Amino acid sequence: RPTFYRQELNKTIWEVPERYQNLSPVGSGAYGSVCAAFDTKTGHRVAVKKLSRPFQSIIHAKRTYRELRLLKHMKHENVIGLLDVFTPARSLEEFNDVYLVTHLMGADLNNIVKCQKLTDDHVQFLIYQILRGLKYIHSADIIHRDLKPSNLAVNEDCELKILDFGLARHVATRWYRAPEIMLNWMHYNQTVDIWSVGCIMAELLTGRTLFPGTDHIDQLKLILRLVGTPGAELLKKISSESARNYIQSLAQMPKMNFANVFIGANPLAVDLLEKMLVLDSDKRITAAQALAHAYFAQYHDPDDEPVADPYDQSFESRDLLIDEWKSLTYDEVISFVPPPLDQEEMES
Numbered sequence: 001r002p003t004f005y006r007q008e009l010n011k012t013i014w015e016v017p018e019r020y021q022n023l024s025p026v027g028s029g030a031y032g033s034v035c036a037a038f039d040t041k042t043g044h045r046v047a048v049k050k051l052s053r054p055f056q057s058i059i060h061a062k063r064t065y066r067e068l069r070l071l072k073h074m075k076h077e078n079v080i081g082l083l084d085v086f087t088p089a090r091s092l093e094e095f096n097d098v099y100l101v102t103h104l105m106g107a108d109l110n111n112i113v114k115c116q117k118l119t120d121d122h123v124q125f126l127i128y129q130i131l132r133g134l135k136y137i138h139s140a141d142i143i144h145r146d147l148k149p150s151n152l153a154v155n156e157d158c159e160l161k162i163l164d165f166g167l168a169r170h171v172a173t174r175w176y177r178a179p180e181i182m183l184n185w186m187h188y189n190q191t192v193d194i195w196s197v198g199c200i201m202a203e204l205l206t207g208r209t210l211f212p213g214t215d216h217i218d219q220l221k222l223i224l225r226l227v228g229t230p231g232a233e234l235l236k237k238i239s240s241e242s243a244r245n246y247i248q249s250l251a252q253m254p255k256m257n258f259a260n261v262f263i264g265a266n267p268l269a270v271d272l273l274e275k276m277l278v279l280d281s282d283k284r285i286t287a288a289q290a291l292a293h294a295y296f297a298q299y300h301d302p303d304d305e306p307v308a309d310p311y312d313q314s315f316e317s318r319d320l321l322i323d324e325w326k327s328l329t330y331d332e333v334i335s336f337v338p339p340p341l342d343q344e345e346m347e348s
């Protein structure tokens with residue numbers, strides 16, 4: 001067991017192994033409190049996330065366990081991977097905080113969009129890597145649920161990682177959200193992530209948020225103006241008469257031509273945007289289909305787009321006591337095994 005030390009940053013107390021040094025706050029979030037740190041043992045800067053009140057309620061406790069299970073499973077070049085998990089607690093009875101450690105990426109997608117207008121080649125590489133990481137996530141039967149520029153980060157080589165997963169089931173931007181998640185459809189496809197990819201791609205191409213809604217209804221207003229009011233084939237899948245009547249009541253809007261909306265963009269990029277930003281989620285392109293799209297010809301390698309090991313999420317169906325959730329989380333903390341040092345990290 002390492003020795004821990006305590007320290008106050010922006011009004012939150014941080015207790016961490018002495019290996020972590022120079023803690024600097026990166027952000028304060030609904031997800032948790034995040035601080036940049038330097039790891040003396042690896043010589044590498046790290047991002048440390050402290051779980052906010054992990055066991056305050058059954059919902060928070062299950063969510064804590066969900067996040068730890070998720071992140072422990074993720075081993076992919078374009079997905080956040082866990083370098084460390086720890087708690088200052090010496091026993092389960094004392095267990096009340098969880099800290100998660102990952103490599104610190106150089107920049108957020110939002111910072112990159114502000115910093116420069118991306119080249120089409122840069123857009124192809126960044127979106128290719130999101131879809132590559134996404135193929136892996138969906139292969140484990142996981143929906144990320146919260147792809148957005150601040151959950152995407154790159155290094156100096158524009159190598160990209162997908163970060164914090166959406167932990168809601170059954171403060172937080174609605175701009176990249178799929179319309180069905182807002183409308184409470186309740187049987188979400190993995191395609192909701194593809195809708196979020198399409199929103200991000202548009203923004204990388206134009207420099208501007210595609211759908212910057214001011215509130216919930218405005219968000220859907222802006223979406224329908226681009227993709228149009230729902231088609232007959234979609235109206236067939238909606239049971240409520242009142243919901244159908246309201247859509248019929250709305251002034252009919254034709255889907256806008258993407259070629260005009262994204263004019264000056266690569267035509268292949270516009271074609272791919274059309275296949276992502278479809279209202280009907282059954283008709284959105286999948287991550288694996290999108291990686292074979294001609295727009296990614298320069299980067300596509302069918303033999304280097306790996307898939308995930310099976311992910312046991314039978315826990316999602318459990319209703320357990322708060323003490324069981326806390327206890328299962330503690331077991332996962334105890335059993336965590338750090339990944340090995342990279343070859344590039346060692347010498348002769």
Ligand SMILES: CNC(=O)c1cc(-n2ncc3cc(Nc4c(F)cccc4Cl)c(COC)cc32)cs1
Pocket residue numbers: 026027029031034035047048049071080100101102103104105106107108150151153163164165
């Ligand atoms: C110079 N560098 C910069 O400015 C930036 C670096 C990053 N960056 N790099 C890695 C990273 C990981 C997380 N989440 C997290 C974590 F901290 C620890 C464990 C697990 C997880 Cl999911 C967050 C929080 O996202 C809301 C931001 C992160 C973003 S801007």
Ligand SMILES: CCCCCCCCO[C@@H]1O[C@H](CO)[C@@H](O)[C@H](O)[C@H]1O
Pocket residue numbers: 183184185186237238239240242243244246247
């Ligand atoms: C008031 C106009 C809102 C339009 C929202 C679309 C209606 C979505 O409503 C959804 O329809 C699904 C299929 O019938 C059902 O399975 C879901 O329970 C229901 O929420």
Ligand SMILES: CCCCCCCCO[C@@H]1O[C@H](CO)[C@@H](O)[C@H](O)[C@H]1O
Pocket residue numbers: 179180183185186187188189230234237279280281282
């Ligand atoms: C009609 C109000 C505007 C929102 C349109 C979103 C339609 C998304 O598409 C829907 O996704 C559902 C799963 O979430 C599927 O069950 C439906 O079959 C599919 O049509």
